[PDB]
Amino acid sequence: ATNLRGVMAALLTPFDQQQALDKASLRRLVQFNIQQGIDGLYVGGSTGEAFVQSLSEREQVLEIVAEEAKGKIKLIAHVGCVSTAESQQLAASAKRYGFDAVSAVTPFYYPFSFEEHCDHYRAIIDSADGLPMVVYNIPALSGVKLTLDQINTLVTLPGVGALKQTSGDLYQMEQIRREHPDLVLYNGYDEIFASGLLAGADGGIGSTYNIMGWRYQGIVKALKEGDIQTAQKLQTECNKVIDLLIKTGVFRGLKTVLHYMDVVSVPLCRKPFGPVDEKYLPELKALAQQLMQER
Amino acid sequence: ATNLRGVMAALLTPFDQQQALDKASLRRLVQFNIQQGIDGLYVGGSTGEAFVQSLSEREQVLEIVAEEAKGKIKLIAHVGCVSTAESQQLAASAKRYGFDAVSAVTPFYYPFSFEEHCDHYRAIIDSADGLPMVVYNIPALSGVKLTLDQINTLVTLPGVGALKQTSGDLYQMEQIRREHPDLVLYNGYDEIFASGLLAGADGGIGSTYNIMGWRYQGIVKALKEGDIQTAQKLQTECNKVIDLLIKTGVFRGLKTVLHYMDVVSVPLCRKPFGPVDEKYLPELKALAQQLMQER
Amino acid sequence: HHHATNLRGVMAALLTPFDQQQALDKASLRRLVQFNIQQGIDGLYVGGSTGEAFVQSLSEREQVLEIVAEEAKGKIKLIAHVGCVSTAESQQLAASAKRYGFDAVSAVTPFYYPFSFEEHCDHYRAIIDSADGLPMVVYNIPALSGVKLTLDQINTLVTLPGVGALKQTSGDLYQMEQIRREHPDLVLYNGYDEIFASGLLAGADGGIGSTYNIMGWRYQGIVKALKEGDIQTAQKLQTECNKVIDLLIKTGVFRGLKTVLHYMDVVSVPLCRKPFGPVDEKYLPELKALAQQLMQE
Amino acid sequence: HHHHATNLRGVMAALLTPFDQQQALDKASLRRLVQFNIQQGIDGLYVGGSTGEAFVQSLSEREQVLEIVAEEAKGKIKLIAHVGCVSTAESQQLAASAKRYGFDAVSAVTPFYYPFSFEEHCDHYRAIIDSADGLPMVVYNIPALSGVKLTLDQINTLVTLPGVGALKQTSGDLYQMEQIRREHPDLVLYNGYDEIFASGLLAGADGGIGSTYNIMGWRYQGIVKALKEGDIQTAQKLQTECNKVIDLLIKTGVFRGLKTVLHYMDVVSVPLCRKPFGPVDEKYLPELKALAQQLM
Ligand code: NA
C-alpha cells in the first residue's frame, strides 16, 4: 500500500448560491491541486462536506474528480456514512469510477460496539471490490473513542492499507508506527503536521492543503534532509494561516481564499454553515494575494 | 401548542429481512401504540433510525404512519438532518401529509455556532408552513451543549411550540419550566420520567413507550393524584426493563420484545446495528409474555 | 444497612467560618452551629467540600470538628467528613472524629491521582477501621473528583462492612433509582440541592447540602410534602430553593452563603479562603435583600 | 521576566519521594536518588511536584524534602521547588521556604478540586510570586489531572504575569505548544508528557520536565542533541525506546513502577507509594527487574 504514501489534499466541495453542486468550480479546484504538485486527493471527506450531501451528490463529485485526475495522482474516495448499506453504495461507485482507495469514518451519532464497527469496515471492504481501505479515526467529531488495541485490529483487517489519524495524541501515533512499521499513516491535524511526522506519520491528509499544499510538502522535504529550522518556519507560517482559518471558519475561509484566487466562484458552504463575516474579507483577500505570489 | 402535551411514543421503524421498510409491521406497530392508549407518536426521530435512512424512506414512513393514525392520536414529524435544506424538504412533506407538528435535532458532527443553530430552526419553521416546531436537544448524542440562555432563545423563536429535552439535568429542566410556564416540555430519558415530571416536564417522548406506554401514563396519573409510592413503583418496573434493554441494545431489544408480541416480523435494526445476542432471548420472551399479561 | 437507619435525614454541609487573616473564626463557627440547630436541621456534615476541607490543614479540620461536637453532640446528628487524598491523613481525622464522639464519618473518593477501584475500596476499609465503630458515608461527587464509578463499583462500595450511607452528589437520577432498587434500606443522601425533590422521588431519603445553612426548613418541607403526597408544595419549595441557587451560582455559592449568614448576624466575616476571591460588590443588595427575605420567613 | 529566566532552560527530572515500610519519609533513599539523578547529567530537579507525591504529603514533609534536596544539589544543578497547593496561603509558605533554602525557581499547579475563576488563578500566582521574593515562577499546566481548562488567551495572560519566567506544559496539544512559542519567543517552555518529548521539542518546547527521567534521563538528553544537530533519525530511536519503557510503566502504575525499578537498582529500599496507591502487581516483577538490569 506504500504507493498511497504522501500529502493528499482533503478536497473541498464547491456549491453555488442555490446550494447546488458547482461542478465547474470542482473541476478547477481539482486542476488547481494538480498544478500545486499535490500527491493525491481525499474526496468527499469531512472537509468535502460529506455529511450535508446525498449519496447521489457524493457520487457526482467522485465521478468528476476521477475524470479530471485519474492516473494523474492518487485518489481516495471517502465513502463513509452512518449506514453500512449507504457506505457500500459509495464504495461500489468509487470502484466504478476507478479510484485507487476507499476510506470511511467510524460511524457516528448512535453508539456502536467495536464488533459492529469491525463488521462495518469488512462490509465496505467487500463492496469496494479490491480497493484498499483507509480507516479514518477522528475522535473529536465522531465521538468514537477507540483504544490502541482496537486501532490495531482495524488496521490489520483484510483489505486495510492505511490510517487517517486525525488525533492530536502523538504518543498514540508512535505506538501505531511502532506496531505497524509499513503502515501508510496519515497525520490528520494540519496544525501539528511537522510533529506528527516525527512521531511517525509518513504523510498527511488535510483541508488547508487546498491553498498551500506546497508548504506541507515543503515540510516533508525539510525534515527528510534534517533541516529542522525550515520545517519549523514552515509549520509556523502554516499555523499563522490555521489561526486565521479558525477565526473565520475553516472550510468557508478556505473557499473564500479560493474565490480570490479565481478558482472557486461562490465560496459558500451548505446550510447550516453561514457565510464568512465580512469583517474578515480584507484578511482573506490579502492572504489569497500573498499565496499566489509565493507559488 | 398545548394540544401537544402528552406521553408520545418515539416510533420504531420496522425493517424486513433485506433491511427495507416492513410496511406491514410498521402499520401494526402504529396500531399497537394506538391501542395502548398512547397520546401520540414522534416519527423518524433517533428511535425511528432516521439517521440510517434516506430522505425518501423518511418521507415514506411519515406517509404510512399518517395514513393510519392521523385523527386518532397526535403526530409529530422529526424532520431534522445535518443539512438545513434536507430538513426543510422533510418538513414540507410533513405539512402535505397532515402532521400536527415537526421537530429537529440540533445539527451534529460539524461544529456550528449558536446563531447557525438558530437560523437552521427558523428556516425549517418557514418550510413547515404553520406546523409548530418541537426543538430536540440531545447533548449526549449530538455533542451540542446548549446553555440555558441558548435554550431560552431557541424555545421563544416564532413557531416553536415545544422542547423535547433528552437531558438528565433536572436543574436545567426546572429552570426551563420556571422561565416558560406554558411550554410543552417533553422529558426525553425514559429512566427518569417520574423525576422529570416532578422537575417540571408535563409529558415525554420515548422509545420504551412502544412496549409499556401505559406504565408511563400510569406514572403521570399517580403524580397527578398524589400516589407517590405508585409513581416510584412504576418507574422502578420501567427501569428494570431499561436495565435489560441497555444490556441487549435498546432499539433491537425493543423490536425483539415486539416480535414475541406478534407485532414485528423481523426485529432487526439497520447495519451497523448488529443482531441481539442469542443469550438474551429467553429473558426477552419472558418480558413480552409478562407485559402481555399486564394490559 | 439497618444499623445506620438512624443516620437518615436532612444535614447541612457546614460552612467553615474564617476571619480577614484567613484564620478559623471559632466564635462564628459556634454561632453557625447554633443557628443550624435553632433552624431545625436534622444534622451537620462537617469539614466537607462546602466546609472548605481542601484548603485547610488536618489540625484546622480537627479544631473545627472538636468545636462542632462541643456545641452539638447529642442534640443533632453529626457526620465528620474526614476524606483526604492520602489514606493515612483520612485515618488521622477518622480517629479524631471518634475522639470527639461523632455519629458518623465520611470520605470523598480520593482525587487528583488516578487510583484503581481496588485502591479505592481499601482506602474506605482503612478509614472504617480508624472510625472505630462510627458508620461510614461514601461521598461520590464525580464532577469535582474526576472519579467515574460504574454502578457495580458503587454497589460494592456501599455494601462494604461499616458503610451505612451514600452521599450521592450526582445529577444522574437513573443511577439514584438503581442504587435504591438494589439497596431498599441504604441511607441515600441527595447531594445537588437544586434537584432535591427529584432526587427523593428517584430513591433518595434525605440529603446533605450547602444551601441548608440558610434555608434548611424548605428541604425539610419538601421531605414532608412528598411523604404526604403533596407534589404542588414540593415543586413550589424546590422552585424557591432554585431561585436562590441561581443567585448563589452567580455570586459564588460558598461566599454567597457566608454573606447571607453575615447579614443574618451569624458570620462575622463572610470570606472563603484564597484562592476564592470576595463576593462582587454589585451582588450585595441582592444578598442583603435575600437575608431579610429568609429571616422574615 | 522571560529574558531573566532563560537560565532555567533545560531537561530536569521530576523527583520521586522514597518512603519506608511505615510509609514515613525514607531520607536515606531520598539522598541517593538526588545523586543517582545527578550522575545521569540531568540539568535539574523539579522537586515536590505530582511525581514527588506532593499531594499526599504535609507541608512540613514537603519542606523537609526541599531542605534535604537543597543540601545535596544546591550549586550543582538547577533546583525548581514545586510549591503548589489548592490553598494560596499554604503555597506561599512553601514558596518562602524554597527561597530560604536557596532554590533557583518555584512552581505551582493550577489550583484544583474547586472551580476557581481565571482572575482567581491569576491572583493565586501573584501571591505565591510575592512570597517567592525574587525567585522566578514556573506555571504548571496539567489539564488531565487538575481539571482546569485554560484558553490560549488565559495562558498568555498567565505566563506574562510579572515574575513568571517559565511554563511546564503537561499537555498533548502540540498546536497550542507551537502557538505559545509563537506568542512568547523567549519563554522557557518545558514539555510535560515524556512520551512526546521529541515531538514537543519540534513544536516549540525548548526543554522539559518528567517522571521517567528518574530511571533513564540520559535518553531524553540525547534527543535535544540530535535535533540541534539536525539528526532526525536518532531522535526517533531514542524516543521510541522511552515509549517502550513508558508502555510498561503505565501497565504497572508509573510512580510505583519507577520506584520498583529503582529498588532493583538498589537506590530505593522500600519501593512503595503512599496509600491509597497499592503495591505493584506481583506478576510484573520479572519485567521490572529485567528492565532495571537492562538500564544498568
Ligand atoms: Na410477527
Numbering used by the authors:
A (entry chain C), B (entry chain B): 2 to 296
C (entry chain D): -1 to 295
D (entry chain A): -2 to 293
List sentences quoted exactly from the publication behind this structure.
We therefore identified new conditions for the crystallization of E. coli NAL (in space group P21) that avoided the use of sulfate ions and allowed us to solve the structures of both the wild type and the E192N variant in the presence and in the absence of a number of ligands. The structures of complexes with pyruvate were also obtained (to 1.65 Å resolution for the wild-type enzyme and to 1.8 Å resolution for E192N). As expected, pyruvate was covalently linked to Lys165, and the planarity of electron density is consistent with the formation of the natural pyruvate enamine intermediate. Comparison with the apo-NAL structures indicates that there are no significant changes in the active site upon pyruvate binding; the only difference in the two structures appears to be a further disordering of the C-terminal residues in a remote location from the catalytic pocket.
N-Acetylneuraminic acid lyase (NAL; EC 4.1.3.3, otherwise known as N-acetylneuraminic acid aldolase or sialic acid aldolase) catalyzes the reversible aldol condensation of N-acetylmannosamine (ManNAc) with pyruvate to yield the most abundant sialic acid N-acetylneuraminic acid (Neu5Ac). Sialic acids are essential components of complex carbohydrates that play pivotal roles as recognition signals in a variety of biological processes. The residue responsible for this alteration of specificity at position 192 lies at one end of the active-site cleft opposite the active-site catalytic residue Lys165, which forms a Schiff base with the substrate as part of the catalytic cycle.
